Amino acid sequence: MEEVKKDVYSVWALPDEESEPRFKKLMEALRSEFTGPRFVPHVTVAVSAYLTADEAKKMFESACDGLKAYTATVDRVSTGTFFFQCVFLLLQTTPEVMEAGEHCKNHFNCSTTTPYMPHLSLLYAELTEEEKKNAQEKAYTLDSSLDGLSFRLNRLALCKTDTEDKTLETWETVAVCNLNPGSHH
């Protein structure tokens, strides 16, 4: 009754200032032959519900006060079946990561039931299976170390995101926090 605007936010686990461009080159690249909206290298651990202004920060506030940094291994390059699961770095369900998913359930607002699939999406583009094969096919001519690939999730970002906005124009970054745990010295 005081705060009256509620929006859907998605929490993004960011890469490394040593990973990102290794990625960004692959992204800005795959996006020329085949195409679409070039975004930021990211792994998504959660998607919220209608959270007001405060109730969102306080919530990212809490999340950031957690989700210790961790690492991912690129199990493989794969293709999905819709504009958002086009080409993506399918990741391995190693412990620490599938648990970054316990984040979507982390405390109170979920979006209750989906089988969390960790991946670093490469491209969004409603393609034809054959060009899909190629996008993937072709992806492996830019990165050969790509497979077996492991990386660190240095931080987070809270983003106002409209999950169906293929134009990604409604996606906007509201905040980010760095997470470099190590604990005891």
SS (H, E, C) the chain: CCCCCCEEEEEEEECCCCCHHHHHHHHHHHHHHCCCCCCCCCEEEEEEEEECCHHHHHHHHHHHCCCCCCEEECCEEEEEEECCEEEEEECCCCHHHHCCCCCCCCCCCCCCCCCCCCEEEEECCCCCHHHHHHHHHHHCCCCCCCCCCEEECCEEEEEECCCCCCCCCCCEEEEEEECCCCCCC
Of 103, 119, 184, 185, the catalytic one is 119
Judged on CB neighbours under 10 Å (0-12, 13-18, 19+), 94 is: middle
To one decimal, the resolution in angstroms is 2.4
Gap between the Cα atoms of 50 and 6, Å rounded: 5
Question: In 3D, which of 87, 77, 69, 168 has the Cα closest to residue 126?
Answer: 87
Domains and CATH numbers, the chain: 1-185 (3.90.1140.10)
Gap between the Cα atoms of 106 and 162, Å rounded: 21
Question: In 3D, which of 93, 98, 107, 94 has the Cα closest to residue 65?
Answer: 107
Gap between the Cα atoms of 64 and 56, Å rounded: 12
Gap between the Cα atoms of 135 and 128, Å rounded: 10
Question: In 3D, which of 9, 176, 1, 14 has the Cα closest to residue 109?
Answer: 9
A 10 A CB-CB count for 125 gives 19
Residues in contact with 167: Cβ distance below 8 Å, sequence separation at least 6, in sequence order: 37
Cα atoms found within 13 Å of the Cα of residue 158, Cβ hemisphere only: 22
Q: Phi and psi at residue 132, in whole multiples of 5°?
A: -65, -55
Place of tokens 């010295």: 185
A 10 A CB-CB count for 99 gives 16
- 119 carries an active-site annotation: yes
- 103 carries an active-site annotation: no
Q: What b/e sequence results for 67-91 when a residue is b if at least 16 CB atoms lie within 10 Å of its CB, and e otherwise?
A: bebbebbbbbbbbbeeeeebbbbbb
Per the annotation, does 81 bind a ligand? Answer: no
Per the annotation, does 121 bind a ligand? Answer: yes
Residues in contact with 182: Cβ distance below 8 Å, sequence separation at least 6, in sequence order: none
Measured in whole angstroms, the distance separating CA 117 from the mean position of its chain's CA atoms is 10
Per the annotation, does 44 bind a ligand? Answer: yes
Residues in contact with 19: Cβ distance below 8 Å, sequence separation at least 6, in sequence order: 41, 151, 152
Measured in whole angstroms, the distance separating CA 106 from the mean position of its chain's CA atoms is 17
Structure determined via:
X-ray
